């Protein structure tokens, strides 16, 4: 019992030639149970006894599944595939359910040996040959190739798929107000008909996929709602997040802590509070993932308000084509933002975080735009559409910094929230330089090769200075210059430099940068009430 | 008939994945589809077909139909050479050019029957809840560089009588792309145009100022006296000048900045630094000599974010040796908008490329990648997409061309 449906070409490579691997050499036992299984594959109509003529070969095995402990059978195609030519990509990017929308009811259709379901492209059949081993090498063994996709096989997926969306292509026009979804060996019908007139077209579909010698389940391998989506359990109506669990022990490996802390920062984009910063800290120094670190005061504690955090069940709902689609964000500490999709307050679609950018030189504004751009991307993708924004960041900040960046930049439609902390510029440099205050002329050399300097400023006024650096870069001492200018000025300063870094702090001014000492830099900057950054070439 | 098309020695065709896309933009994608389905000039494929090749919606400039655009730029640049038509310069000595699109003539030709799998694109779905639709070419493609070149002879042919008839007048075919270029004033133009369309539309098919353009020296600020910094500034910009005309000189300012003096303290300038300085703007007057452009070399356009709306280009090939220097202002509307701004600049640099040279230059884009894919096809309008790059905007190279001559009033539009 096979199908009437029209294969696919499939071919090789280019130019190379199907697997001739040999035959792993199995026992009686082994061997009998897989003669018994391919004997009833062969009547089925799936694979085929062939002979002398096919010299391409793949190794068959026997493995005893847990659900009847019963011999199965396997056959490692790794090499058939590797040599079978390239397919479409296969739908990578599945639905997430905050895009899907809810249904009055929804079923889920198992379309079980589906592969075997389907013809193989004849001519590429062949190389699909496999044989089972004689007791110890024998007389020849028996030999069969598949005439339908093979489970394991590189085209299976790819063409089963393809297969199934012309074989559902009638029904779908015949009935729009139905919506199917396949994945794997699984359709997922969902609809907003009465409960009747939905499980009636189930089984007209079913009886249509009948009609193509696709089986469907049995009551008994039945699947019901809610249905666990990857980290979600879905409900027709809504969906709630799998209460993630945490154990309790006296004795955690890194393994433990690393595989700990990943489930831990999954869970940080829907729970609120999430942190693991002190337990990110135990891994310092492991020697060994067999290693026991025990948990500090500072671990154990916050491992506990995780445990007190994830014992609340965070509901959620689905996509409203009719009403609005807003993002709010937030600015949890420096890098780090957190954002939340709604259509109507606090029932949510979606929610994440996105970690610390750590980096070469920006600021939050940048940062903010990125993480607007992030969202925007994922709306897109989820909901054809992007959100309307709602940023804690007065538009007044946003037009100043924007219309004067050297990069271009961009903010969808949007709206300022005020939920602190508000980002802001932390600091400006002046557009001039300052009448009146003081004129720091400063000068940084380092011997790169010794990694000796120093650095030091003469003023206008009198004020000069000069301090010997060791292990140091001709980079830094340029940057301790203008440090111990801004650390020995005023609230207001003018200073100059033949630094081309300068330049790049002049035209970005960046308020975070991978340098501490940049950092300390910025942080004078924003200590000023007025700074004038002046570059003038070298020598 | 169908002329056998290849592909480069050892090239495969592109497996680009599809950007994802709004909806409003899927729909119509879908609606265009079915359509050029029904009347077959694509069809849907299979999974065996492995290539792809990007796909979206811009709108024809005017009406609210969508246009199906291709982004075929991989494919065009494994497609096989035809070893076009050489560039007519009379076309940038024209008053007023035209730009037409004749990409729908390409319909009528059928392509190669093993080309077709190279042609395939995909329509996705939102939220990934459908499959994505799968189809091909069975026709000359839209935005293919194979197809203004095989639709030569045609082209030629319809467009003979229109020449003769007037033949003062220049046509320009790039891609989809026809550029008309004539003497004639505005309405005896157009009026001329539309006796070009109407030509063309018995068969099946649908304001630049070329003489107006490319020039724009450096001017150096002048002012009642100058401080410490105004010259500090000054002395820095024409030390990265010297890259260009190594005649500018700035050891008499330099000495003038001799001593630790406060930036805005005035300083006089002597007789010698006036005279570099004038000798300077003298230098400065005209664009540098020995700059020939090379057919053979890459073409390019870098451009800086000047702010306000405004922007600065340079199309050279080699560093400093500019075959053109220009400014971008805003157009109406994008006045909050850095990509609408960014996409337009970068179309009219493109267009112009077109009408001096007959090719696109490559962009060094002062974006972020992500923000630049993210949202520049919302503004694009040209059947042509130009090849780009994101680059950090070297502080210095703004600040010099922001220098560059701006009108005295302007170009008068009474
Ligand atoms: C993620 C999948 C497996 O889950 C469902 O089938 C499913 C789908 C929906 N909504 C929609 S639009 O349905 C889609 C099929 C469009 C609502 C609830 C569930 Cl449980």
């Not at chain 2, 002597?270 to 300085?277: D, I, V």
Request: net charge neutral.
């Amino acid at each position: 019992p096979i199908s009437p449906i029209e294969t696919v070409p499939v071919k090789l490579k280019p130019g190379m030639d199907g697997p001739k691997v040999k035959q792993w050499p199995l026992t009686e036992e082994k061997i009998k149970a897989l003669v018994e299984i391919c004997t009833e594959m062969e009547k089925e109509g799936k694979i085929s006894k062939i002979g002398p003529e096919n010299p391409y070969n793949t190794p068959v095995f026997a493995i005893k599944k847990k659900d009847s402990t019963k011999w199965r059978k396997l056959v490692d195609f790794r090499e058939l595939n590797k040599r079978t030519q390239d397919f479409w990509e296969v739908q990578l990017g599945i639905p997430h359910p905050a895009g899907l929308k809810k249904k009055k009811s929804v079923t889920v259709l198992d379309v079980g040996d589906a592969y075997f379901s389907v013809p193989l492209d004849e001519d590429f059949r062949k190389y699909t040959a496999f044989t089972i081993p004689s007791i110890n090498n024998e007389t020849p063994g028996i030999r069969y190739q598949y005439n339908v996709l093979p489970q394991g096989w590189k085209g299976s997926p790819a063409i089963f798929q393809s297969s199934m969306t012309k074989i559902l292509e009638p029904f779908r026009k015949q009935n729009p107000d139905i919506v199917i979804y396949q994945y794997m060996d699984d359709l997922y019908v969902g609809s907003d008909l009465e409960i009747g007139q939905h499980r009636t077209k189930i089984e007209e579909l079913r009886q249509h996929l009948l009609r193509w010698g696709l089986t469907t389940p049995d009551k008994k391998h039945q699947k019901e709602p809610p249905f666990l989506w990857m980290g979600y359990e879905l409900h027709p109506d809504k969906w709630t997040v799998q209460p993630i669990v945490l154990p309790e022990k006296d004795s955690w490996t890194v393994n433990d802590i690393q595989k700990l802390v990943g489930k831990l920062n999954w869970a940080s984009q829907i729970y609120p509070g999430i942190k693991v910063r002190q337990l990110c800290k135990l891994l310092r120094g492991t020697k060994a993932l067999t290693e026991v670190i025990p948990l500090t005061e500072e671990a154990e504690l916050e491992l506990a308000e995780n445990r007190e955090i994830l014992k609340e069940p965070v509901h959620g709902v689905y996509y409203d084509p009719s009403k609005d689609l807003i993002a709010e964000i937030q600015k949890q500490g420096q890098g780090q933002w957190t954002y939340q999709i709604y259509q109507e307050p606090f029932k949510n679609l979606k929610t994440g975080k996105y970690a610390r950018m750590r980096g070469a030189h920006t600021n939050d504004v940048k940062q903010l735009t990125e993480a607007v751009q992030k969202i925007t991307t994922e709306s897109i993708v989820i909901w054809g559409k992007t959100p309307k924004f709602k940023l804690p960041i007065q538009k007044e900040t946003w037009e100043t910094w924007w219309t004067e960046y050297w990069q271009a930049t961009w903010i969808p439609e949007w709206e300022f929230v005020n939920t602190p902390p508000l980002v802001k510029l932390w600091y400006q440099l002046e557009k001039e330089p300052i009448v009146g205050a003081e004129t720091f002329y400063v000068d940084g050399a380092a011997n790169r090769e010794t990694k000796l300097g120093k650095a030091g400023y003469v003023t206008n006024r009198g004020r000069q200075k000069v301090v010997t650096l060791t292990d140091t870069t001709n980079q830094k001492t340029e940057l301790q210059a203008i440090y111990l200018a801004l650390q020995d000025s005023g609230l207001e300063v003018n200073i100059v430099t033949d630094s081309q870094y300068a330049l790049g702090i002049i035209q970005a001014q960046p308020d975070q940068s991978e340098s501490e000492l940049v950092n300390q830099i910025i942080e004078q900057l924003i200590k000023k009430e007025k700074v004038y950054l002046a570059w003038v070439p070298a020598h | 008939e169908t002329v056998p098309v290849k592909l480069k020695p050892g090239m495969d065709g592109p497996k680009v994945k599809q950007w994802p896309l709004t909806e409003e933009k899927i729909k119509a994608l879908v609606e265009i589809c079915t359509e050029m389905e029904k009347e077959g000039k694509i069809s849907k494929i299979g999974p065996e077909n492995p290539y792809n090749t990007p796909v979206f919606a811009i709108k024809k400039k005017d009406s609210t139909k969508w246009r199906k655009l291709v982004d075929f730029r991989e494919l065009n640049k494994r497609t096989q050479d035809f070893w076009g038509i050489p560039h007519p310069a009379g076309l940038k000595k024209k008053k007023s050019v035209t730009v037409l699109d004749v990409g729908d003539a390409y319909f009528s030709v059928p392509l190669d029957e093993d080309f077709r799998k190279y042609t395939a694109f995909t329509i996705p779905s939102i939220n990934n809840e459908t499959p994505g639709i799968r189809y091909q070419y069975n026709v000359l493609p839209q935005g293919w560089k194979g197809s203004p070149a095989i639709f030569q002879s045609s082209m030629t042919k319809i467009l003979e009588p229109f020449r003769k008839q007037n033949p003062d007048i220049v046509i320009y075919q790039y891609m989809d792309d026809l550029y008309v270029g004539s003497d004639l004033e505005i309405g005896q133009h157009r009026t001329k145009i539309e006796e070009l369309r109407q030509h063309l539309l018995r068969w099946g098919l649908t304001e630049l100022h070329p003489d107006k353009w490319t020039v724009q020296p450096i001017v150096l600020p002048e002012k009642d006296s100058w401080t410490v910094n105004d010259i500090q500034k000054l002395v820095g910009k024409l030390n990265w000048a010297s890259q260009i005309y190594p005649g500018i000189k700035v050891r008499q300012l330099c000495k003038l900045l001799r001593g630790t003096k406060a930036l805005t303290e005035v300083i006089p300038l002597t007789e010698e630094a006036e005279l570099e300085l004038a000798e300077n703007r003298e230098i400065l007057k005209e664009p540098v000599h020995g700059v020939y452009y090379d057919p053979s070399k890459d073409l390019i356009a870098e451009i800086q974010k000047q702010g306000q709306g405004q922007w600065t280009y340079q199309i050279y090939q080699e560093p400093f040796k500019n075959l053109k220097t220009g400014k971008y202002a805003r157009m109406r509307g994008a006045h909050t908008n850095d990509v609408k701004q960014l996409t337009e600049a970068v179309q009219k640099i493109t267009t112009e490329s077109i009408v001096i040279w007959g090719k696109t230059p490559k962009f060094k884009l002062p974006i972020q990648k992500e923000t630049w894919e993210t949202w520049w096809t919302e503004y694009w309008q040209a059947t042509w997409i130009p090849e780009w790059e994101f680059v950090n905007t070297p502080p210095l190279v703004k600040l010099w061309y922001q220098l560059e001559k701006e009108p005295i009033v302007g170009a008068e539009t009474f």
